[PDB]
Design a protein around this ligand. Structure first.
Ligand SMILES: Nc1ncnc2c1ncn2[C@@H]1O[C@H](COP(=O)(O)OP(=O)(O)O)[C@@H](O)[C@H]1O
Ligand SMILES: [Mg+2]
Ligand SMILES: [Zn+2]
Length: 670
RNA sequence: GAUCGAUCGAUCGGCGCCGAUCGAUCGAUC
């Protein structure tokens, strides 16, 4: 099979002695083989009559599947029962029939957290070796931190029998959130205490052998100047000024709904301001139902158009003007066919008046994004120096991912590129997201073989996913903490690989330099901590654990009070009476629906039949029809309703059903 | 294999929230 290297045996030396250690090593050095060697040494040290029990806490379903596969390929020869439980498994063979019947369990932290919460698993004393893959995720309320909280509550105070040995497989301790070396050392000590670890053993003796396996790529900053002749920006700013003037003429109180003083077009500040104004416009009270409905609908349309224009301006500064124009046209086409209105027709005519000028300006070779020009130049230079490279170009947004894909596919200069999309699961407001097998089949085709030359990922290909050794780590304005910097930089580990960082905003290069200084400070702090004695560090982590336990078990009572009186749910756009609180039924605490014949004639059905408001021109989505065991009763979304009291006139808003505190009557077919 | 609803957690940016990114769990569907 595989032969253990020198550094792979050095990293597993303190773990094989019986002490809780943290294995810090660069990404791609083979920490999985170190964990396998530790598991083999742990399961072979028990005398006759007893038997160990190892649990490997993964973080992702692909990572969990890969770990289960490698553990089965490595351990089924010795005669150990390797198993794995996750979200994909069916409601059968309870965990007590799997944990008490196997030796190596590849688990997910939320499954064990739920099992310890509902009281299925008695305590963590059943296991003998817990291995947390990428233990840097131990944070304020991470499921790793919940398992560690349970372990510490079992250790401190109510001392139970033998406790399992905790071992981390992180790649970076992530001193992020700290300022100087003292705060970095404090954070490292806090993390080692939360994980109950006494050793941060790293490769120090045979460091020359590690460089022949993993190669730290050289960083390359690229500050590009913003465009000067931006006619698209000017036209969209004029349209936004016209829309804001109309909204102010119809409202007369827009300057007092938000506290934002200086709001410039095409920034996140204007987005926050317009979101606050939209959320404050839905809360209106006046003795005129039709007038209030008309005013609120007009204000909702105005703020929706302003937010869409601001999103188009934000997309225009990161991609081509054609992408922002296509986004605006798609939004206008989707909102025009929904509902025709006077304000809607006015805004559509005002937009189509400048549509020809926008089409003429966007289709200009001189009006090209300088960031995209520099990216194309870098790609040309890299693929001309070596035509066998693979790019792992990182992007912040999904819309920007699609824009970069359409730009690469539609560029005569970039004829040698075969782009690939890699997004995350779960639907969004615009995108639908990629599933697990789609991600797997796309990542399996991105390598030196072919069918793919550049993977346009977005914050998903830098956590736990195994990818081929890349030669280009261009970061299209994608920065974060020191952990994210080390994770993305660790993707390209081939011989003679670079890591480009393109940006057009003064401050991103400063943040990347701060992250590099924080990484150097983290390395210095680890080197300083690796010189302390075992007793002093054990006493320090014990004091930190005692303080954390005293702080944690003192404020864990966020108990609310349920509401009793009836409340009505008016629409969010037109503010029409939809239903009351007494008619809202709850199926299984996650299927909030409405029961009543009055509500059936208050929506229109247009995946499954998504419902919309039954008014003249509203087209506001309330919810969707779900096919239950027998019925097809529709569920609603609280993100499209406003709650109004019957006695009082308050109109507070709620983002999720958990914030809405009321008498949740359980659903009943009878 | 493809959805839907709910919930949790982490990260980034901006003024406790908002927007974005990702991960997971629980339930039902085809
Ligand atoms: N002793 C070894 N001999 C051969 N290949 C090894 C050895 N140790 C590790 N590797 C390779 O290194 C890779 C490391 O992958 P993985 O552990 O998932 O990522 P990371 O090392 O970043 O945690 C494995 O795919 C394995 O093939
Ligand atoms: Mg790993
Ligand atoms: Zn409506």
């Amino acid at each position: 099979p595989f032969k253990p290297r020198n550094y792979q045996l050095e990293l597993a030396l303190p773990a094989m002695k019986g002490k809780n250690t943290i294995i810090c090593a660069p990404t791609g050095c083979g920490k999985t083989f170190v964990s396998l060697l530790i598991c083999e040494h742990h399961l072979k040290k028990f005398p006759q009559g007893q038997k160990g029990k190892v649990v490997f806490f993964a973080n992702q379903i692909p990572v969990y599947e890969q770990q289960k596969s490698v553990f089965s390929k490595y351990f089924e020869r010795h005669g150990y029962r390797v198993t794995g439980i996750s979200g994909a498994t069916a409601e059968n063979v309870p965990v007590e029939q799997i944990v008490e019947n196997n030796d190596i369990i590849i688990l997910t932290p939320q499954i064990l957290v739920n099992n310890l919460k509902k009281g299925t698993i008695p305590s963590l004393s059943i296991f003998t070796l817990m291995i947390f893959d990428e233990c840097h995720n131990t944070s304020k309320q991470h499921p790793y931190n919940m398992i560690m909280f349970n372990y510490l509550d079992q250790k401190l105070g109510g001392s139970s029998g033998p406790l399992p040995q905790v071992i981390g497989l992180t790649a970076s301790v992530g001193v992020g959130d700290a300022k100087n070396t003292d705060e970095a050392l404090d954070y490292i000590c806090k993390l080692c205490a939360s994980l109950d670890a006494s050793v941060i053993a790293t490769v120090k003796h045979n460091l020359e052998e590690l460089e022949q396996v993993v190669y730290k790529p050289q960083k390359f900053f690229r500050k590009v100047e913003s465009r000067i002749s931006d006619k698209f920006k000017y036209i969209i700013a004029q349209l936004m000024r016209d829309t804001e003037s109309l909204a102010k003429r119809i409202c007369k109180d827009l300057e007092n709904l938000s506290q934002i003083q200086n709001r410039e077009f095409g920034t996140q500040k204007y987005e926050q301001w317009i979101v606050t104004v939209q959320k404050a416009c839905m809360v209106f009270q006046m003795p005129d139902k039709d007038e209030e409905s008309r005013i609120c609908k007009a204000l909702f349309l105005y703020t929706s158009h302003l937010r869409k224009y601001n999103d188009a301006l934000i997309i225009s500064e990161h991609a081509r003007m054609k992408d922002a124009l296509d986004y605006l046209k798609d939004f206008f086409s989707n909102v025009r066919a929904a509902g025709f209105d006077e304000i809607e027709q006015d805004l559509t005519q005002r937009f189509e008046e400048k549509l020809q000028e926008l089409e003429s300006v966007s289709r200009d070779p001189s009006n090209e994004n300088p960031k995209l020009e520099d990216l194309c130049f870098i790609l040309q230079e890299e693929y001309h120096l070596n035509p066998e490279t693979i790019t792992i170009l990182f992007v912040k947004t999904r819309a920007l991912v699609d824009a970069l894909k359409n730009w690469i596919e539609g560029n005569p200069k970039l004829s040698f590129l075969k782009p690939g999309i890699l997004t995350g699961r779960g639907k969004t407001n615009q995108n639908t997201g990629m599933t697990l097998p789609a991600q797997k089949c796309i990542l399996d085709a991105f390598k030196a073989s072919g069918d793919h030359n550049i993977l346009i990922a977005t914050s998903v290909a830098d956590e736990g996913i195994d990818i081929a050794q890349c030669n280009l780590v261009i970061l299209y304005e994608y920065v974060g903490n020191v952990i994210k910097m080390i994770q993305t930089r660790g993707r390209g580990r081939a011989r003679g690989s670079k890591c480009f960082l393109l940006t057009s905003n003064a401050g991103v290069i400063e943040k990347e330099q701060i992250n590099m200084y924080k990484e150097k400070m983290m390395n210095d702090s680890i080197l300083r901590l690796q010189t302390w004695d075992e007793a002093v560090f054990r006493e320090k982590i014990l004091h930190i654990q005692t303080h954390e336990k005293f702080i944690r078990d003192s404020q864990e009572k966020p108990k609310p009070v349920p509401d009793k009186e009836n409340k009505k749910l008016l629409c969010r756009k037109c503010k029409a009476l939809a239903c009351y609180t007494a008619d809202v039924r709850v199926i299984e605490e996650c299927h909030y629906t409405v029961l009543g014949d009055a509500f059936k004639e208050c929506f229109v059905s247009r995946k499954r039949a998504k419902i919309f408001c039954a008014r003249q021109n509203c087209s506001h989505d309330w919810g969707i029809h779900v096919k239950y065991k027998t019925f097809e009763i529709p569920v609603i979304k609280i993100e499209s309703f406003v709650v109004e009291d019957i006695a009082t006139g308050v109109q507070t808003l709620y983002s999720k059903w958990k914030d809405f505190h009321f008498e949740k009557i359980p659903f009943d077919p009878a």
